[PDB]
């Protein structure tokens, strides 16, 4: 069933814009949405179809206090993305309250697309954690979608902000977003600003324009994470089928990313897997262990060697994990597309459930706890205080995210069979 | 009068013999007699249909 | 018998201009009316035959306070439309009064064409509801034609204005037009501006210039609704024969439209029917139910598949209706024309009697009722007051349209066998 992408907030709209442009170039699509003359792929799921093979994506672009959405409109690809579904503070509470008043019209925008599609599997949110306008509104919309579509699933490509720690209310905002995400999101794929910036310093000399270039890194991860759906293959021909292995327990649904040729601008599968398990490739910044690992390879891959590659990588034991989970790593394959450069002919990505990210959650919880004792930035404006006089949803989020941290470490423990 | 027409049109346009063109026209005509109620067995059904048209002209008056 | 199109008002003349241009391109006609050299169609009804193959349509273009009719004149197709039949406020009363003084010579323009044609079935009005000059004059002319031609019928391609609610007397104007249309119009095909921007959402990059580019939408619908007449087929070879199914009771003669490939710029008949019944393909913005549905498909449709589609649609039950009327949904076919692009060569439209349009009527009656209690905008002009001192034609229209609303809901209840 077709997937609808709910890109919201300035940062979320930037990364959704780049992702859809990336899939325009990758697929047989021109900047006006026209089927390319030069042009074997399952474009049904992500792009709505005309018989001349015009392909407008099912993007929902939500703008609040718009600045960069005007730049999105003044682009060559404005004709490409036209579901005509753009409807007009830096605080989570301000974003939540601003979302509440316009919830019906944006949800009617959702309903129109849901009706238009033959059918609907999933809502993929290009969400921004502690994203000012993006956060709060994304949390409220996340709470609305599950209630309205209980059977359906929500994924969140959360760009978790770590910038070495400007917004002073970041821990507060992020803490609230994680409560809503922990109880009201089926899946989350986490990315890190410091991790991608460190990769940027590694591969290039770019330091100052981090955000503009890191968009490309995020877009490559996003496209590669869906390529197995976008192109037919033997297995994982549907999102839920892929998601099941990656998320073994509902609470621990946050996923790690990695990409073998970070400098993708011949290598055997043994090499790409071994490279992939190394930490410099990992794009995320007491014993600790993975819960489950999965890897997808797109290129000139010889088929007899992929089992032998998994066997060798087992001998290497580069990835150490003794979780409660029995999930073993699996070598999966997808189709490298034509018309784009085939540099580094074999190129792979991994999605994994790893307990290390509990550390990153605990870092923002630590910042929040310190800030909370100080009460240096309680916000308590007319908006903040009136919306939250008790300020007790913050403590509710603190206990929920603390449950999540404890659950992660319990998953590390041998006895997650018992309650975590 | 359209499915049988397509069927005939295929069985003529592929065929390369007039003895088969004849025998395709034949089965088209016979199949229209049966899809319509003009057969020698559907006489009662045809009479009923005429008796439902009778009420239409009655209403006209 | 030949059909004459009484296009009036600025907006009505715009859509009649575009409709006749659309049928010029579709038929074997050049911009000077000459038979095209490159050129199986029944052009008798819509295009008068000149001796030297000037196919001049039977268009009666009525201008009042002309601005856009001069632009219509300075066009390449001015020679195409040359019956030489053009004869020179924003209030319904102003339009009606202005029409009254010119009523004889415009009626002589009708008489001349009626005599010139071999014979005459129908008057098709490109009418604009609450169109300033268009409304009032169209209502008066509608009242004159039925008296002068009691046997003959009037259809109205009413572009009912919904623009999210500038014309401040719009509810009053639309109210009076609906009284005249309810009691003095044989058929009405309802069109909506908000629904037309909403049908334009996903199909073309026409978000901001919608009203400018909704002309093409209206033109496609108008052409497709007549294609079964303009091109020969086994059934519905006359306007009245088609109309009879669509309007089962005289009062409820307002028809909803829909078009399967909104992005018409292979699909089986099963697919086009199921798509068409969905609300996105629909272009109109307590139980509610259709009274009767009809669909026409123009394309290379396989014949042993249309009946598959009919009964498959019966199993799907995508269209829910339990009216008093016994008229079931029916599959019809027409001929796709040559010389134009056959992209999505199968392509369909639907005309249906739906009770939902009662809601759209009741919205303008709500606006009128509120405005009427306030009496903010009575206009109080000397034209308005002198022409209606009592202001009781507004109340007569209110009770007549309220009867229409009650009759729609009467069609909904199981006992429309009694008086509605």
Short mmCIF file of N, CA and C in Angstrom, two decimals, chain A residues 48-52 54 56 58 73 78-79 82-84 86 112-113 115-116 118, chain C residues 197-198 200-207 263 265-266 274 278-280 343-345:
data_model
loop_
_atom_site.label_atom_id
_atom_site.label_comp_id
_atom_site.label_asym_id
_atom_site.label_seq_id
_atom_site.Cartn_x
_atom_site.Cartn_y
_atom_site.Cartn_z
N UNK A 48 2.45 8.94 -6.71
CA UNK A 48 1.16 8.80 -7.38
C UNK A 48 1.35 8.79 -8.89
N UNK A 49 0.53 8.02 -9.60
CA UNK A 49 0.79 7.67 -11.00
C UNK A 49 -0.22 8.30 -11.95
N UNK A 50 0.28 8.79 -13.09
CA UNK A 50 -0.52 9.05 -14.28
C UNK A 50 -0.09 8.08 -15.39
N UNK A 51 -0.93 7.91 -16.42
CA UNK A 51 -0.60 6.90 -17.42
C UNK A 51 0.54 7.36 -18.33
N UNK A 52 0.74 8.67 -18.48
CA UNK A 52 1.99 9.15 -19.07
C UNK A 52 3.17 9.04 -18.12
N UNK A 54 3.67 10.45 -15.29
CA UNK A 54 3.91 11.57 -14.39
C UNK A 54 3.75 11.09 -12.96
N UNK A 56 3.90 12.51 -9.13
CA UNK A 56 3.91 13.47 -8.02
C UNK A 56 4.02 12.66 -6.72
N UNK A 58 3.53 11.60 -2.75
CA UNK A 58 2.52 11.83 -1.72
C UNK A 58 3.16 12.48 -0.49
N UNK A 73 8.89 26.65 -2.58
CA UNK A 73 7.99 26.97 -3.69
C UNK A 73 8.76 27.53 -4.89
N UNK A 78 8.90 22.60 -8.00
CA UNK A 78 7.57 22.94 -7.51
C UNK A 78 6.48 22.27 -8.34
N UNK A 79 6.70 22.15 -9.65
CA UNK A 79 5.75 21.40 -10.46
C UNK A 79 5.82 19.91 -10.15
N UNK A 82 3.15 18.65 -6.21
CA UNK A 82 1.94 19.50 -6.11
C UNK A 82 0.72 18.66 -5.71
N UNK A 83 0.53 18.35 -4.42
CA UNK A 83 -0.71 17.76 -3.95
C UNK A 83 -1.47 19.01 -3.48
N UNK A 84 -0.90 20.21 -3.68
CA UNK A 84 -1.48 21.51 -3.30
C UNK A 84 -1.99 21.43 -1.86
N UNK A 86 -0.21 22.73 1.16
CA UNK A 86 0.61 23.56 2.03
C UNK A 86 -0.33 24.57 2.66
N UNK A 112 -7.80 13.62 2.32
CA UNK A 112 -7.85 13.67 0.86
C UNK A 112 -6.85 12.71 0.23
N UNK A 113 -5.59 12.76 0.67
CA UNK A 113 -4.58 11.86 0.12
C UNK A 113 -4.91 10.40 0.43
N UNK A 115 -7.83 9.07 0.80
CA UNK A 115 -8.91 8.69 -0.11
C UNK A 115 -8.39 8.54 -1.53
N UNK A 116 -7.50 9.43 -1.95
CA UNK A 116 -7.00 9.41 -3.31
C UNK A 116 -6.23 8.15 -3.62
N UNK A 118 -5.11 4.31 -3.73
CA UNK A 118 -5.81 3.03 -3.69
C UNK A 118 -5.86 2.49 -2.27
N UNK C 197 -10.82 24.06 -7.40
CA UNK C 197 -9.46 24.19 -6.89
C UNK C 197 -9.03 22.90 -6.19
N UNK C 198 -9.99 22.25 -5.52
CA UNK C 198 -9.74 20.99 -4.78
C UNK C 198 -9.58 19.82 -5.74
N UNK C 200 -8.23 20.38 -8.66
CA UNK C 200 -6.96 20.80 -9.24
C UNK C 200 -5.77 20.60 -8.32
N UNK C 201 -5.99 20.21 -7.07
CA UNK C 201 -4.89 20.04 -6.12
C UNK C 201 -3.75 19.21 -6.68
N UNK C 202 -4.03 17.96 -7.04
CA UNK C 202 -2.98 16.97 -7.30
C UNK C 202 -2.55 16.89 -8.76
N UNK C 203 -3.31 17.52 -9.66
CA UNK C 203 -3.20 17.20 -11.09
C UNK C 203 -2.24 18.12 -11.85
N UNK C 204 -2.28 19.44 -11.60
CA UNK C 204 -1.38 20.36 -12.30
C UNK C 204 -0.91 21.46 -11.36
N UNK C 205 0.26 22.04 -11.67
CA UNK C 205 0.83 23.10 -10.86
C UNK C 205 0.03 24.38 -11.08
N UNK C 206 -1.19 24.40 -10.54
CA UNK C 206 -2.12 25.51 -10.70
C UNK C 206 -2.68 25.91 -9.34
N UNK C 207 -1.85 25.80 -8.29
CA UNK C 207 -2.28 26.12 -6.93
C UNK C 207 -2.77 27.57 -6.82
N UNK C 263 -5.45 13.51 -13.81
CA UNK C 263 -4.20 13.57 -14.57
C UNK C 263 -4.30 12.73 -15.84
N UNK C 265 -3.42 13.92 -18.59
CA UNK C 265 -2.19 14.31 -19.27
C UNK C 265 -1.05 13.36 -18.91
N UNK C 266 -2.04 -0.34 -19.59
CA UNK C 266 -3.35 0.26 -19.82
C UNK C 266 -4.17 0.09 -18.53
N UNK C 274 -13.85 1.78 -10.39
CA UNK C 274 -13.60 1.84 -8.95
C UNK C 274 -12.94 3.17 -8.58
N UNK C 278 -14.48 6.92 -6.10
CA UNK C 278 -13.82 7.49 -4.93
C UNK C 278 -14.07 9.00 -4.86
N UNK C 279 -14.06 9.61 -3.66
CA UNK C 279 -14.39 11.04 -3.57
C UNK C 279 -13.33 11.98 -4.13
N UNK C 280 -12.07 11.56 -4.26
CA UNK C 280 -11.08 12.45 -4.87
C UNK C 280 -11.42 12.74 -6.32
N UNK C 343 -3.42 9.90 -24.51
CA UNK C 343 -2.81 9.51 -23.24
C UNK C 343 -3.86 9.05 -22.24
N UNK C 344 -3.57 7.95 -21.58
CA UNK C 344 -4.55 7.17 -20.85
C UNK C 344 -5.78 6.96 -21.72
N UNK C 345 -5.59 6.15 -22.75
CA UNK C 345 -6.54 5.99 -23.84
C UNK C 345 -7.93 5.57 -23.36
#
